[PDB]
Design brief:
The protein is mainly α. The protein is about 45% helix and about 0% strand. It is classed as nuclear protein.
Length: about 120
């Protein structure tokens, strides 16, 4: 025998830069989960090794699209293959932290954060 299948088609799209690799993005979420959605500067320092004088908005944009990719907007689909492990962790922090400000849909979970101290000469 032999059958066919149907799928969805794209319409529009906008982008200037390139997508982040699973290994790269893996840090964005992991960092946002520990540092939360209130410490972007720390997320860049913990995630990106070269976050000396790097911006904090960069990581903020990547995350925004990350969570939306988990299961929010249909047109927000980056298209590229994304690990369900990240999308899940992202929505966890985005929703968990969201409860602090707004309210849309959270889950039964909690987390924490903390910094360290390193003095030299």
């Amino acid at each position: 025998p032999v059958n066919q299948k149907s799928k969805r088609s794209e319409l529009s799209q906008r982008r200037i830069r390139r997508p982040f690799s699973v290994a790269e993005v893996e840090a964005l979420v992991e960092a946002v989960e520990h540092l939360g959605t209130g410490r972007w500067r720390d997320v860049k320092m913990r995630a990106f090794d070269n976050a000396d004088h790097r911006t904090y908005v960069d990581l903020k944009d990547k995350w925004k699209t990350l969570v939306h990719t988990a299961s929010i907007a249909p047109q927000q689909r980056r298209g590229e293959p994304v690990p369900q492990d990240l999308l899940d962790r992202v929505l966890a922090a985005h929703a968990y932290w969201s409860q602090q400000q707004g309210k849309q849909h959270v889950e039964p979970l909690k987390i924490l954060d903390a910094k360290a101290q390193k003095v030299g000469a």
